[PDB]
Curated annotation (Swiss-Prot):
Ligand binding (Zn(2+) 2): 82, 166, 208
Co-factor note (free text): Binds 2 Zn(2+) ions per subunit.
Residues of the full protein shown: 43 to 270 of 270
Organism annotation: Klebsiella pneumoniae
Taxonomic lineage of the native organism: Bacteria, Pseudomonadati, Pseudomonadota, Gammaproteobacteria, Enterobacterales
Main location group: periplasm
Described function: Confers resistance to the different beta-lactams antibiotics (penicillin, cephalosporin and carbapenem) via the hydrolysis of the beta-lactam ring. Does not confer resistance to the polymixin colistin or the fluoroquinolone ciprofloxacin.
Quaternary state and interactors: Monomer.
Keywords: Antibiotic resistance, Hydrolase, Metal-binding, Periplasm, Plasmid, Signal, Zinc
Biological process per Gene Ontology, one example term: antibiotic catabolic process
Name used for this protein in its record: Metallo-beta-lactamase type 2
Binding site residues for substrate: 169, 178
Catalytic activity, EC: 3.5.2.6
Superkingdom, taxonomy of origin: Bacteria
Essential cofactor(s): Zn(2+)
Length: 228
């Protein structure tokens, strides 16, 4: 783990790093949130912001220092502060931003700034490719409503990594965490749909746990069975 200011960076594969930021949240302790940084040839792609603009600007500083290539775009995986809290920092840096159309719709009422571009999805869950131009190895998938109605997930082609965001919890998690905006009826199915979308992925990266095996998917889905 590389400590960089108050953030933590962890290399997961030759061209993939996890970014981690913390929010000292009254009543819940200091909460970690994870996203990804992916180098694709001569550019960098970001999955999710940090909790704040200042933290997100530090992600961009780390990228400048450690990779020193332009950030082509960012994709954010739902309209909550842990994933979209730093949108203004991205926009100030001239980075093109993408989110689920529904996330952009929800952003203002969630207290977030919307991304510049809206992803739409086919019936089977795969992103409509015209809406995700120049995504390179990022394979975007809407698994159905779960942690939130708008949650999306991302696989990284050329690696064994898939990012479940806030939908997936680790294999030893006691609970599904914050269910305030969750769809309790569809959660288990959506977690299983994520696993089926990225069947070869052996490292599952998540918003609020360290990377785990596919046991995170099975455990998450089993816990979600009890919400029905
Ligand atoms: Bi969240």
């Amino acid at each position: 783990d590389q400590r960089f200011g108050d953030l933590v960076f962890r290399q997961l594969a030759p061209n993939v790093w996890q970014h981690t930021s913390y929010l000292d949240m009254p009543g819940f302790g200091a909460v970690a949130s994870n996203g990804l940084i992916v180098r694709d040839g001569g550019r960098v792609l970001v999955v999710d912001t940090a909790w704040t603009d200042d933290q997100t600007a530090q992600i961009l500083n780390w990228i400048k220092q450690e990779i020193n290539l332009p950030v082509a775009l960012a994709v954010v995986t739902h309209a909550h502060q842990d994933k979209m809290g730093g949108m203004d920092a991205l926009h100030a840096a001239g980075i093109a931003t993408y989110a689920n159309a529904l996330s952009n719709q929800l952003a203002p009422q969630e207290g977030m700034v919307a991304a510049q571009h809206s992803l739409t999805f086919a019936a089977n869950g795969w992103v409509e490719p015209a809406t995700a131009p120049n995504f390179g190895p990022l394979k975007v998938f809407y698994p159905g409503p779960g942690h939130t109605s708008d949650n999306i997930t991302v696989g990284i082609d050329g690696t064994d990594i898939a990012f479940g965001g806030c939908l997936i919890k680790d294999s030893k998690a006691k609970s599904l965490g914050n269910l305030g905006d969750a769809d309790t009826e569809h959660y288990a199915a959506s977690a299983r749909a994520f696993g089926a979308a990225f069947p070869k992925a052996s490292m599952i990266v998540m918003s609020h746990s360290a990377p785990d095996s596919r046991a995170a998917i099975t455990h998450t889905a089993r816990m979600a069975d009890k919400l029905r």
